[PDB]
Amino acid sequence: VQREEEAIQLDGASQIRELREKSEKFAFQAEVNRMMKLIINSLYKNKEIFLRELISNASDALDKIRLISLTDENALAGNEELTVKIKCDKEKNLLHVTDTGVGMTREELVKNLGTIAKSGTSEFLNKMTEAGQSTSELIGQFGVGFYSAFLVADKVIVTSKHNNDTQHIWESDSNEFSVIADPRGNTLGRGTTITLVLKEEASDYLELDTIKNLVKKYSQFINFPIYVWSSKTGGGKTVWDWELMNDIKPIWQRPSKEVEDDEYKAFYKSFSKESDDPMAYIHFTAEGEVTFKSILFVPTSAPRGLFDEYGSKKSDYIKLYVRRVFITDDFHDMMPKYLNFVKGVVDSDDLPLNVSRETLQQHKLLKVIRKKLVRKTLDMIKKIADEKYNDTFWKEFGTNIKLGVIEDHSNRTRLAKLLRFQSSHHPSDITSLDQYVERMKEKQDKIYFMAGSSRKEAESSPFVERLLKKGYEVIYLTEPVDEYCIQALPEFDGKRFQNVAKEGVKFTKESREAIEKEFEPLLNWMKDKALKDKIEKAVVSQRLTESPALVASQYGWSGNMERIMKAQAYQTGKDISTNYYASQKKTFEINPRHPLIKDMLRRVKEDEDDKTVSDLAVVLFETATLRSGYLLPDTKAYGDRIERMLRLSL
Amino acid sequence: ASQIRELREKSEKFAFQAEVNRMMKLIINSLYKNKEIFLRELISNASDALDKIRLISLTDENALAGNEELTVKIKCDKEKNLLHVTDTGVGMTREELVKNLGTIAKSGTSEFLNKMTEAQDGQSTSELIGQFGVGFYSAFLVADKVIVTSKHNNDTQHIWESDSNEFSVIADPRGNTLGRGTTITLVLKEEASDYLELDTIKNLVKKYSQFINFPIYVWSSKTKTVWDWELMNDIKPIWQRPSKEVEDDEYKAFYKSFSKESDDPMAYIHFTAEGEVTFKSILFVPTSAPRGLFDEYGSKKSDYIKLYVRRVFITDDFHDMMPKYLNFVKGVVDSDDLPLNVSRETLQQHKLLKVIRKKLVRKTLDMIKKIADEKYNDTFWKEFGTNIKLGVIEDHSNRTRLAKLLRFQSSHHPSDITSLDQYVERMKEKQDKIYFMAGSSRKEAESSPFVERLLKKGYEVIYLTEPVDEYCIQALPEFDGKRFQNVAKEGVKFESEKTKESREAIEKEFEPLLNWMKDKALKDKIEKAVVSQRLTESPCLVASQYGWSGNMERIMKAQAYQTGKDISTNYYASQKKTFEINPRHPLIKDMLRRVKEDEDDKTVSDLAVVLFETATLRSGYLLPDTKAYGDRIERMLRLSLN
Ligand SMILES: Nc1ncnc2c1ncn2[C@@H]1O[C@H](COP(=O)(O)OP(=O)(O)NP(=O)(O)O)[C@@H](O)[C@H]1O
């Protein structure tokens, strides 16, 4: 009972040897010449990332002197501007990336630049941590970024000016570097100028527009003014001046509400390069394993190239950022296919990057991004007002939501509540599934729907004629994807969907059962009158009203289901000529009120071997197939029957 | 470069340095995406050691010294949490264990290779794999401590063990336990428990090391069940053998083994590509269409073709090397000259992807073209006919060559499919047009009122049965000079004799008739009415040149991947058609005698709306309203009884 004071443990490499002893511990070395060549020749895919790294280095340099500027009063001195400035020089085959950051002392120019996998930024980070404090803008981690500037240049000339030290010149050729004091005075007030002596194969980076698009591609949010010595050709002659590249302001960095509705729409217009305001937007911050904080958008109109090469075409609408630096627009694991219209940004600070800085190192961190992005998206679409949802949204991205029901399984219930279809409750207006079950009768327990090519052919369908007459609500499907969306949905609010073109619809009746038994002779004749496999059953329908009714099985293709499959291109030659083709099992149904009842029976009561009575019994079934929206086997069969029955009549 | 100064001066020069521990961490946690590549690297290293000791043997007679067997053996201890990769290669001296394993980016293989290139031997300059000295370090992706025991000739057996930080070397107190070679023992992490089950390892070596040119054995089970070494790589690299010295039966055996198929390939091709890139390749076409060939369609890379560099598996992702419509082509691609990324999972030069692609497609299409005509129609076209059609639409660079491979059902034979070169060889002396009809089936297409006069006159009509066919022909501007012509659209020009200009007189005879239909029958239904010059034995609907056919409309109306706007606001769905009227038709001649008798006549109007609606059905067009047609035909059936 009384606890003793003894404490347990919780934890603790063989080879068949007698005993293991210690001897001669070494430290790993490195052949620098071959390691350098690995980085330059066999590491990166795109050689354009050199500017991305040089700018990031310049950004870190700027952020460093800014932190020091806080705990100092003479840090900036003469020049208080913290800007990165890039200038081309085609006349001398040179590219310049100049910044006004902290710069580098002579010891640093040797140590930091001359040592692979050495990061002064990483070390600076460490001192700041030991010392709110916002290092969270420091991008550098590896020590190889600067060496990526040897991809497009034979020689790199680095001129740096650190406080309390002389301006020096650092020149290299990837094999060795020379460090010399600048003969000129402190031409640079403070900071660094990285000059690249480009190669003949890199003549592209001498041209202006190449650089402009390059800095805009990777570095447009790096929290420091980036200018490029550009031409304007106005006032009309060419005038050169520093043109700002990162115009856009990181709205995401600010917390909710600092900025309002206004500056949001402006952000969407500028970032996504759109002219019209977004239909909606969401600003949120996920935290935990992933912690990023992002802004997502839904466009006002459906993009022009939407649904073109669906699945294959990766959308560049969402751009991934890590520490204000662009990583990738590939969200095929962080965003599903049916949400390929959603635009926006995703920035983060502690997302582990690959050395390529184009992909996240941990593949496991992708789906945890998706679960938050998708959820925030579906909440955003749900947050859209009911009026605006039907009148504007659904026309644009209704198909997407339907596809979501088919694809996404973990959001099928949530997406189903966003579904909108036409109905019999209104000649034109669309309804939700929640609005259907709210208008459902007692003990209905079935959501009746009709699928067809158009609204007119669906509402004027022989099926559910008694259902509409009884007051049952019928959902009309007018688009090819509709039927699949419903078929992929098991139950909604405890109600099961029921196709009115297929069997399963059930509506005294026991007295009427005796009446059906009376209507037994004609059905038998139909199976004989009817060719071999022409029909399966010829019972009389109790769901008909005023129409002379091909009903599919519970596990059979509908007339509308059938037309879509048949018109689908991507299918093999062997597969096309298959699946039973046209016939399946065509069940006939009928109601008594006209020639269906006694007029056809009088002939059947007279003689079953008459030619006139077999022709009239054939055309009735013939036009019933088109009445039920099925494919006509022969256009000339039912066609010439009209050309002959109208010649003597008219 | 000059910079405002005319005094470029020379001061101190330095050599670059490295912070090893941080560069180590980069390789461990920030380089590779797949942690399973560790076994790929150890096998390659083991292979290199085996190739070195063999190259020495060719000049040194005392190298083997009673250890002639050159193999690789893998054994994993589940109980002891260990993984052993043992070879009988050249091994490493004590100095080499420190130099080669302790110096990052240092490759002893690269040094061994350069010595041979310097003088005359190019015998095995393509057998050695290791270039950058970082592969061995991928062992710490799945292991905390790596123990390496090596025995080199003319030196004692030493033991090398380490974590990422420091490494130690010690002479093995067990002595010469390995006759010659190396054993890399990996103390696997908790997470890397999967590499302890032999079957996981079994598939892993087979995945990458299938043609490593050295016997690889794994300690596995085989049924009383007993344990022994099982050979992994048995599939010989036949592509290295020249086209003349390779057995035709070997190709069939190679395919059924490499691609895991029970049936022989429909065809094969063996070629050596030189120039910008240099590689050997054996492409294959399966005997039957793979299930799910088009299920993903687009967005799906096919693991049918595999890329090998120096007999080591690189990748199966080809999408930049092979187009979508050739996703059925299987085979191998091997090179010894293609520069690789440090990850060894992709090519380094992206520009070379286009170079390989154009070579592979070229040899693929020629391979298809080489197939005998007799076996082509009966086997290939049935399985991959759809692919060729898609290729016509997609590949513009080879649209002509792919067109020569197209096959379609013609009116020249009840069931046989024909070539387009056969069609143009069966055209008249002044046809210069390829007439075709598109429909849901052949029965619908051959019994269509558009081909009535054409077949009677002596012209040939191609029948398109599959919905992708019209897309395929649309992508074709002209074939052998001739131009495709839709028989359901305007353009067909028939008869230039005196009987043709006599039809101009019939135009005036039908002029009051023509205008009546535009205003009696629904004016917003029928576009226009014109005299039908191409109509024989039928009552009655053509479309414009750049307009939808009845078939074309049937497909678009089923295309599910469209927005709710594009389907509701599509003009072609609401577009009207030109109604053509045949003069010889008895039902048409009695129609002009009824309007005059009773213009604004009710019965006269009725037949016109009925005929037009039957014309919509006779063509591929869907009836706008079927209830109005279904009720009026119920009144027509009242002729028997009311
Ligand atoms: N423009 C610059 N101004 C000032 N200091 C710089 C500049 N560029 C580089 N440095 C310093 O030199 C060090 C080496 O940089 P680098 O080798 O590019 O690795 P990095 O800074 O971590 N970038 P990366 O390898 O992509 O993570 C940096 O950590 C800085 O301390």
Ligand SMILES: Nc1ncnc2c1ncn2[C@@H]1O[C@H](COP(=O)(O)OP(=O)(O)NP(=O)(O)O)[C@@H](O)[C@H]1O
């Ligand atoms: N099992 C072994 N037997 C003999 N020598 C070995 C063995 N493993 C490694 N070595 C030597 O150690 C050197 C360093 O290994 P490694 O880091 O893999 O360089 P590598 O051969 O270029 N591998 P890779 O990265 O794929 O190019 C190799 O170049 C070999 O000379």
